[PDB]
Design a protein around this ligand. Structure first.
Ligand code: 6XT
Length: 331
């Protein structure tokens, strides 16, 4: 027998209530700017589907980030553009400034607002208890917004969070894996980086929703408060679920499998074993205790659930006691 269907607990029908054009990205026509407005300054890095550069817009002298695409299906390019245009102006959402057609590569190049990022491998070792709560609340503003707008990011991880610490400015970037949520839709499970993949992806449960981003956020919170990067360190996608089971326990995992009538890959049988649910205290030591409090642990536990339906929504997460001083300081 097949798996039990699932629906998002919140923002379930927001795309159904919108005109077809909002989410029907295959019919989206791309609006092209002038490629001569931009002069590349230097390379910043690379991605699976791109090469990214710092550039100067020669019409206004503004610094921009240019993402020149590698060959990618036209519908996937239209999807990222549509999602970016839909989320434009949203809290802590990266701004897509322009779309141009590269002359050498003949591919599109997406032009973004520049963020003066403080590299995560250097920034995280300086963050206080307050900074983690502050930036976690800022990520939640972006997530509650994109979820309310019927979009799942599906690639939440430290590298997709640009922080200008000096200006306490955060932007959630790289919407290249983002999708529109539609009740009853089965999505590709081959999304996100290994360490941030939700149990639904690892067990091949396709009818997932916004709650997938909440698991990714929990992985990020666990890595920050415990100073353990990555928190769930799998050797591959199968071992990734084993790393989760050694912390969350195998009992809740088999309960989750049973609830949704998920047929487990036979490989999993011999590697999952039997594991008790651990207490968060075993990850606490003299070097991370200043970032760990009962509020942090209670909040973390409520994010890292096998059952996607039982994880906090971004809005419920914002109401958690862990953020009381951040909320009070923002008012
Ligand atoms: C466009 C996109 O999402 N792809 C992406 C981006 C990067 N890298 C940066 C670097 C900076 N800022 C420089 C100071 C570090 N910014 N700023 C705003 C956005 C952005 N992106 C690397 C790799 C990829 C794939």
């Amino acid at each position: 027998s097949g798996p039990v269907p699932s629906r998002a607990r919140v923002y379930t029908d927001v795309n159904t209530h919108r005109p077809r054009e909002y989410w029907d990205y295959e019919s989206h026509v791309v609006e092209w700017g002038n490629q001569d407005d931009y002069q590349l300054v230097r390379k910043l890095g690379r991605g699976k589907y791109s090469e990214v550069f710092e550039a100067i817009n020669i019409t206004n002298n503004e610094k921009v980030v240019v993402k020149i695409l590698k060959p990618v299906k036209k519908k996937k390019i239209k999807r990222e553009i549509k999602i970016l245009e839909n989320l434009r102006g949203g809290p802590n959402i990266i701004t897509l400034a322009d779309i141009v057609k590269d002359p050498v590569s003949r591919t599109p190049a997406l032009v973004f607002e520049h963020v003066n990022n403080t590299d995560f491998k250097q920034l995280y070792q300086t963050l206080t208890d307050y900074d983690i709560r502050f930036y976690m609340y800022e990520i939640l503003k972006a997530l509650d917004y994109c979820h309310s707008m019927g979009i799942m990011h599906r690639d939440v991880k430290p590298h997709n969070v640009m922080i200008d610490h000096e200006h306490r400015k955060l932007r959630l970037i790289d919407w290249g894996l983002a999708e529109f949520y539609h009740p009853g839709q089965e999505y590709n499970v081959r999304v996100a980086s290994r360490y941030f993949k939700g149990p639904e992806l690892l067990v091949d449960y396709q009818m997932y929703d916004y709650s997938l981003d909440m698991w990714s956020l929990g992985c990020m919170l666990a890595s920050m408060i415990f100073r353990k990067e990555p928190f769930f360190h799998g050797h591959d996608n199968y071992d990734q679920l084993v790393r989760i089971a050694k912390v969350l326990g195998t009992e809740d995992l088999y309960d989750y499998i049973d609830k949704y009538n998920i047929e487990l890959d036979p490989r999993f049988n011999d590697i999952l074993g039997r594991h008790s649910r651990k207490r968060w205290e075993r990850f606490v030591h003299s070097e991370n205790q200043h970032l760990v409090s009962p509020e942090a642990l209670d909040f973390l536990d409520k994010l890292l659930r096998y059952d996607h339906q039982s994880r906090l929504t971004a809005r419920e997460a914002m109401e958690h006691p862990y953020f009381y001083t951040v909320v009070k300081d923002q008012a």
